[PDB]
Each structure stands twice: as C-alpha cells, then as structure tokens.
C-alpha cells in the first residue's frame, strides 16, 4: 500500500531563467503545494504506473543510488515516443528512443565482484529500439526532480543534496534550477521509474499555486510562501512581504456559491398546439403541407398516450422516450395526409413519389415523424388530398413545392395547357373507405426539432425544478434568471404583476408561477475576508474575520462586523489595539 | 502549395478525421483508432448503425476540383523572443561596444541602452537580470 507523508516545502524551482536580487516576486505557475500529501515508495526485499497529471515532483533519497531510470509517455506500447532516462555510473544517459515496452523494465545488480553490481548490460526494458527523436550522453543523499510538459517542453529541475535523515523528506528548503529542456512534444499521461534489482522515493503532483518567492542577493531562492495554503499566507501574497506587521489586512473575498438551480414554469397553463396539428380539421396537402411553429410550450407529448393513436410513431434522430427529458428549440410539425404506402417514403434519405417530389426529408433529419389513419374521417370518394406526380428533379430539404406550371415531358412548349407531352404535375388521391390498407389515407405529422446548441422555447414534458427556501440557489422563474436566497415574504403584489423590484431596479421580489406566492431575493453573502494578525514577529497565528456575514456558510464567534474565526471572545474590555469594526478590537496576549 | 500535380494520381493515402467527440486543442494529435459512436449501444470497436470510422481519406484525383485539389500545408512555428536563438536570420554576431549608446539584440532580447561591465553575479543557467520594475536591467553576453 502507498504510504503518505508530508511534502513540507520541497518542490520550489526557478520558474524561468531570469535573475533577481533581494526582491520578493510573486509568480503563478505549476508547483508542488506546501504540506500536500505525497505518495511514498520503496525498493526492498514497486514501480507501478503513476498518473502523470500536470507534472511530477519526484525525489529519491539514496545511499547507493539505486533509482536510476524513468519511462514516461501515454501508451507504453511505443505508439508514441517515450522519454527514457538512464543514469549509468555517474554518466547521464538520456533518450527519447522509441521501443516496445516490456512490463517490468529494470536494472540488474550482482554482488561483490570486479565489476560492481555488474548487469550494466542487464537492460531488458523491451525488445528493441526503433526511432530516436533525441539523444544525449554524459540517508546520506537526496535527489529531487520536477517533470512537466508544456509547449512541447519536458522540463527537468534538479537538486543533488546530501541530507541526514533515514525516514522521510528532510524538512528544509532549497529550490530547483533547470537541468535540461528536451522539447520532444510527445504527451505523457503515465510513467514508470526504472530500478536496479538486487531505495525510497516520492511522487508529488504539480498544481497551479501562486507563490511569493524570495530571491536573495546572489539571486537564489531562500524562501517561498504558498498563497492558497492558509489565511496567514494569503496575506503575504497581498503585501509582497515575508514579515506581515501587526494590524488587520483585507486579503480575499468569498462568494457563497449556489446550491443547484430552480427552473419554474406555471403548470398546465403553457400548452403546445399539438392537437391543432394532430387533430387539425383538414390537413394541408402533402405537396403543400402545414408547417406550424411549435415554440414557447411545455411538451404535451405525454397526453398522446391515450387516444386512437398512430399508424406509426417513428423518431428518426433521437429516442422517443427521452423526449420526457428532452427540451427543444425549433419544433415545426409537418402536417399532411397521404396514401397508405407512403408513410414509408417519409424518412431521411428515402426515394419515392412522396419523398422525391411533393415532400422531402433531409438526410440529416432529426425528429419524430408521426402518422395515423384518417380512414375513419377523411375517407367517404375524397379527392381533396392531392400529390405531385412529376417534377424536374428531387426536392431540396423540406421543399414545399406548390408550382402549378403544367409539367412538360417534351421540348415543344406546352404554353401552360394540357395535351400530348403536357401533364398537370399535381395528381389527386381519391379516398374511398374500402381502398387497400396501402391506399388508406394516413394523417402524417413530422416534428422537426434541432436538439442542442440553442436556447429552449419548447419546454420538456417535465423540465421542472421543485422550489427551495432559505438556501442559496441559482433560479430561473418564467425566463427570469437570478441567483439568490429565496424566502417567504409578506410584500403583496397586484395580481397582473410579475417582478417586484427595488430602488436600484434590481430584482427583489418574485411570484412563483406554479403556485402564486411572493418570494424575496437576497445576494449570496460576500463581505471581505480580513486577516487579523499580531506581527509575524510575535506569532504565526491569525484570526480570520469574515465581514458582514452570518456564521453558517463558513472556535467561532459572531460579531457586529461579521463572522470572526480563531479568536477567543473576552468579556473583559481593554484598550483598542487592532481595530476591527463596531468597537470590536483584537489583541494578541492571553 | 498544391500537391494536386504530384500526390494526386486518386490518392487515398492522405486521410482526415471526419468525426471527433470534441474539438482539438493546439497541436493535439489524435492517433486513436476508436470508431465514432453515434448510438447508445456499444460499437465494440466494430462498425454498424451509428458507428462510423471517423478517419476518412479524400481520394485526390488531378481531375478533382480546386476545392478537392490536395494542398500541402506546412505551418512554420516559432517561439519569438526571451529564449536562446537557434534558427537565426542572415545576421552574424556583431562586435560588442561598451559605454556607448547602442541599439542591441542579445539572443533575441532587444532594447536600447548603455552596456557596461557589471559585478552582479548570475547563476549559470540564467539569462536575464531584471529590476523591480520588470525592466530588463542586466544581461549576460551569450558568447
């Protein structure tokens, strides 16, 4: 099992090649945060794949210097380049050479002969090497590296330092200079170190902290302060100082983030004209068909289950059942009646008399096509539903062709009259109730909905959030969006009204549509954070004041000025020392 | 430039990605052979309904239109300044002059100043010095 330990301050490096002196320079870069939890390893009596993340802080304490190798990359099948690093008898040896990996690469060590450890031919990491897009050649001790990929640059920082500790990362701070900078470009999600087989070592994970660095007169980092670490260190990041003198400092701000969201539309009142399409009195013809805008409506498709229903229900693009969860953007019902066999011809990419001539679905069509029999009504016969027999070509996507110009088979001009080589292009279906099931009139509606990428007009059959109070939420009421604390409220609207407001025109009170009730609003919390400290010369302890909040959303104490943390209230009263607010004054002593 | 007069013979060996589950990040190469799955059912690596091999190759014929005439696009990529210069223009390193106002370039770093001898002491890997104001205060003669 991987055992943890405490990173301490290790893992600070020179972020670029600039020189400075006696300056405290803020920098924001990928770092190993202070006191983060760091995985810990062995070689005893063990070199698993590890996630590369955004980088690694590797370190290996050594006496006999057994941990000599690294294998990095995405795959480990050779499909990419894998950086390889082999440190042989103090000679740096580096390769990006591509090869087909064996599971368990290593180095051999044989005991006590003229070649010490031998097996400097051991070296079975793999079958054989193919491409090399680079090449290079060249507890007492501790060796510390940092490996990160940016700009196709795999950067290597190093400190070779002696130590006295057996157990763990020594507690002390020295910062890493760049050893090499191979810009191979190959990505690395995973890696495997390379060991000598008869050695503790660490892996941290770089994270985008902000540090405050101290370049000494020689231009060496003697100190670093991690901003996000804790209250006191956020201060030093504002002051650019390592000694924060006595008194209160505003550092950051906290914005209480909302809980989830509230979408609210009034129930049963917003209903889409689905019947005025499905149940419409007389559908427009298949050659000219009704495109009825379907928008601004909660989807009523769930009522469609109990009815005479449909000869077919066919959704080309997406699942018919997920419609319950699926809110729309552009829905246009394509409403017409046809002969029986031609519901078939309605589908993306169909070739037929309907599909090519009087009605056309695109090949990319997405939506639910819906057809059912009119044999019980539209049949009596009935010549009123008519079709297009002839056209010069196939139709374009959703082409409505009403053109009554007489179709002409020959080159001799017909001049717009019927005759030989002169045909009226639009032919009618006679509908007799005893006609074949494929001659029966079928009532077709084609819902064309565009799915994602656009704001939603047609509301999902449910698409409803329940309502929560006294808890910061991110709310939408009948298209009104806002984020606040929704509460009960006694202010009384006029009936026709919608939004309450305030002197600032900012939204204040609202009315819940599904059940009329007057809800207040309220910003999240805010207030500034304030770090009350005695001088860093006295203590490193700080008491945080959250300004102008109630103590929930955070040894705690409630004040007039806000939520104070980490300072014990005192009923005694002394001279004001560090001014806070509204008479509250803090001092360090017992 | 046009490869239509050479690569086109057409040419199926020049291939493109017809589908990706997202849009690439800069210089991100997707070499994965994974089929594009447009359905909920697993493609299991094999094609089918809503399973398309996303990597397609235009056949490039010299008869194909100018739109389909294959063009070879080489994108030169350079890092500008602040870094040691490897690719350099036809400019050979001049002599250095001190205590006299000079325009200058060091390793691509450019400015105008009075170059002098200075005793501030770099760490070896370093390049620039800098002052409090993020000006370029002190530089090391690379050669």
């Amino acid at each position, epitope marked *: 099992p991987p055992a943890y330990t405490n990173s301490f301050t290790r893992g600070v490096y020179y972020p670029d090649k600039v020189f400075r002196s006696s300056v405290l320079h803020s920098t924001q870069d990928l770092f190993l945060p202070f006191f983060s939890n760091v995985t810990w390893f062995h070689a005893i009596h063990d070199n698993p794949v590890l996630p590369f993340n955004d980088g690694v802080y590797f370190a290996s304490t050594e006496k006999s210097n057994i941990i000599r190798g690294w294998i990095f990359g995405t795959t480990l099948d050779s499909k990419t380049q894998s950086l390889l690093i082999v440190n042989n008898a103090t000679n740096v040896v580096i390769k990006v050479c591509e090869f087909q990996f064996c599971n368990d690469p290593f180095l051999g060590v044989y005991y006590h002969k003229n070649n010490k450890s031998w097996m400097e031919s051991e070296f079975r990491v793999y079958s054989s090497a193919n491409n090399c897009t680079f090449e290079y050649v060249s507890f007492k001790n501790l060796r510390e590296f940092v490996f990160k990929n940016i700009d196709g640059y795999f950067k290597i920082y190093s400190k070779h330092t002696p130590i006295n500790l057996v157990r763990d990362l020594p507690q002390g701070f020295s910062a890493l200079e760049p050893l090499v900078d191979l810009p191979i470009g190959i990505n690395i999600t995973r890696f495997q170190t390379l060991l000598a087989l008869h050695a503790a070592y660490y892996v941290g994970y770089l994270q985008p902290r902000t540090f405050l660095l101290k370049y000494n007169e020689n231009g060496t980092i003697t100190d670093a302060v991690d901003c996000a670490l804790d209250p006191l260190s956020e201060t030093k990041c504002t002051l650019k100082s390592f000694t924060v003198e006595k008194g209160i400092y505003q550092t950051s701000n906290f914005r209480v983030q909302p809980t989830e969201s509230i979408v609210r539309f009034p129930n049963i009142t917003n209903l889409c004209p689905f019947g005025e399409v499905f149940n419409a009195t007389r559908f427009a013809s298949v050659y000219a068909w009704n495109r009825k805008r379907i928008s601004n409506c909660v989807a009523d498709y769930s009522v469609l289950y109990n009815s*005479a229903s449909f*000869s077919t229900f066919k959704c080309y693009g997406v*699942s*018919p*059942t997920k419609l319950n969860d699926l809110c729309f953007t552009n829905v246009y019902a394509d409403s017409f009646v046809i002969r*029986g066999d031609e519901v078939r011809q309605i589908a993306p990419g169909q070739t037929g008399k309907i599909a090519d001539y009087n009605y056309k679905l695109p090949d990319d069509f997405t939506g639910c096509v819906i057809a059912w029999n009119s044999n019980n009504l539209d049949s009596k016969g009935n010549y009123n539903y008519l079709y297009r027999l002839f056209r010069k070509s196939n139709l374009k996507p959703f082409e409505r062709d009403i053109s009554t110009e007489i179709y002409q088979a020959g080159s001799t001009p017909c001049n717009g009259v019927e005759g030989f080589n002169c045909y009226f292009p639009l032919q009618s279906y006679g509908f007799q109730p005893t006609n074949g099931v494929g001659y029966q009139p079928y009532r077709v509606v084609v819902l064309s909905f565009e799915l994602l990428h656009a704001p939603a007009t047609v509301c999902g059959p449910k698409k409803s959030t329940n309502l929560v109070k006294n808890k910061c939420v991110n709310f939408n009421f009948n298209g009104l969006t806002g984020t606040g604390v929704l509460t009960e409220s006694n202010k009384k609207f006029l009936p026709f009204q919608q939004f309450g407001r305030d002197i600032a025109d900012t939204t204040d009170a609202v009315r819940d549509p599904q059940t009329l009730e007057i809800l207040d609003i309220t910003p999240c919390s805010f207030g500034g954070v304030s770090v009350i400290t005695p001088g860093t010369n006295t203590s490193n302890q700080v008491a945080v004041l959250y300004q102008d909040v109630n103590c929930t959303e955070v040894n705690v104490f409630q004040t007039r000025a806000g939520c104070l943390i980490g300072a014990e209230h005192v009923n005694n009263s002394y001279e004001c020392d560090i001014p806070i607010g509204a008479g509250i004054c803090a001092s360090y002593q017992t | 430039w046009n490869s239509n007069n050479l690569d086109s013979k057409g040419n199926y060996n020049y291939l493109y990605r017809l589908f990706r589950k997202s849009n690439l990040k800069p210089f991100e190469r997707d070499i994965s052979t994974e089929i594009y799955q447009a359905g909920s*059912t697993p493609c299991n690596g094999v094609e*089918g309904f809503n399973c398309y091999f996303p990597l397609q190759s235009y056949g490039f014929q010299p008869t194909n239109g100018v739109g389909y005439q294959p063009y070879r696009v080489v994108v030169l990529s350079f890092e500008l300044l602040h870094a040691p210069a490897t690719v350099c223009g036809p400019k050979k390193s001049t002599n250095l002059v001190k205590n006299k106002c000079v325009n200058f370039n060091f390793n691509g770093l450019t400015g105008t100043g009075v170059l002098t001898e200075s005793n501030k002491k770099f760490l070896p890997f370093q390049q620039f010095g800098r002052d409090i104001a993020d000006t370029t205060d002190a530089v090391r003669d690379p050669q």
Partner: antibody
Amino acid sequence: VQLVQSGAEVKKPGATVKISCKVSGYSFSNYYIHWVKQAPGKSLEWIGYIDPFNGGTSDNLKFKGAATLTADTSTDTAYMELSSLRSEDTAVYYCARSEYDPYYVMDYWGQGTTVTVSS
Amino acid sequence: IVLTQSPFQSVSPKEKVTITCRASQSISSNLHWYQQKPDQSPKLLIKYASQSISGIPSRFSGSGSGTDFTLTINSLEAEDFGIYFCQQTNFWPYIFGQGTKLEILK
C-alpha cells in the same frame, strides 16, 4: 432466411446488455426488424421495431431500459441493448423481421435471446 | 390499444377451436396470430388476420368483427396444440395476446 443472434448474456441488476441478431437469406435493408421479449412463462412483450436504413426506433414505454435497437448494414446484425437492467428483464429476446411500411408481420424470428438479470 | 387472448383452449380432435383476440377501444383491420410450441419462438399462422403464409395448415383461420378477433382452427391435430398470440396492428406498438395455451384431449 436466417436470424443469427448473440449468445445468452447473464447480467447484474443495474448492468447493461447488448444483443445481436444477424440477417441472412433475405434482403436486410428492405425489412424492418421487430423485437419481442418473452419473459419466463409469460407472453410476448414487444420492446421495439427498428429500421435497417434509419437509426430511429419506436419504443414500447413500459419497462425503461434506455433500449436502443441498432442494426448493421455490413453484417446485417441487429443489436438490441437493454441497459439499467433489473431482475424482471430476465427473459427471452426474439428478434423479428418486419416490412418497410404500415404492414407489420413477423413470420421469422431468431431462436430468441435468453438473458438473466440476477444478483 | 390493449388486446387480450384466451388463456387456455381445451378441445378434442377434429373439433373446431375458436380463440378470441379482444382489443379495447379502436381496432385495426390487420392482425397476426402466433403459434408457440414450448421452449420455441412463436410461429406466425395468420396475416392481416385474413391470410396464412404458405405451408401453414389451411385448417387455421383468423378474422375479426367489431373489436373482436378470433383464432379459429378446424380439426385440431395432436401436433397442433400450442401457445397462441395475436398482434395488435397500427395504433402505436403492438400488445400481443397474454398467450393462449391450447391443449388437445382424447
């Protein structure tokens, strides 16, 4: 003439199962495929009919497994996946040939796909 | 949109069995009958309720009137008796009969 199906898949509750039925002996693109489930000792339960040419389906609502019928043009192999599995879904799955219009018969099936959802 | 079938159908050889397919609300001209032998896929005996596919015994018959459809088999044989289903047609997807288990005594 033949409908060749994937083997018997036995799964856990909340797991997923996808199941193939291959078309041969007749024209694949010309015929839709019904899909009819038979629970143990129970009646025929119709999950969906599919199209070879189009990837959309009509779904009996009933049991909700996010069922998606997916055929194949090259292999003529019609998959039926049932996800979010539950011990009710233990049953036989019969792929069933259909027409390319209102007319709906199945005169030929596979052998049926026995599937067990059990803990 | 819901149709039911006779659970069991006990009769004697040569006698004519009639098995009702009763579909609630509106019914469709078309219907299809499924003979199932144990541990086997049901077999389609009937098309549009009016037609049997070739090789299926002409003793098998089906029809409909009002909302009622009936599977009528004349002169049952000892190989015939099996589980019966009837398709719903159009009117949204098809609820098969609950099944009709046919036994032949004697």
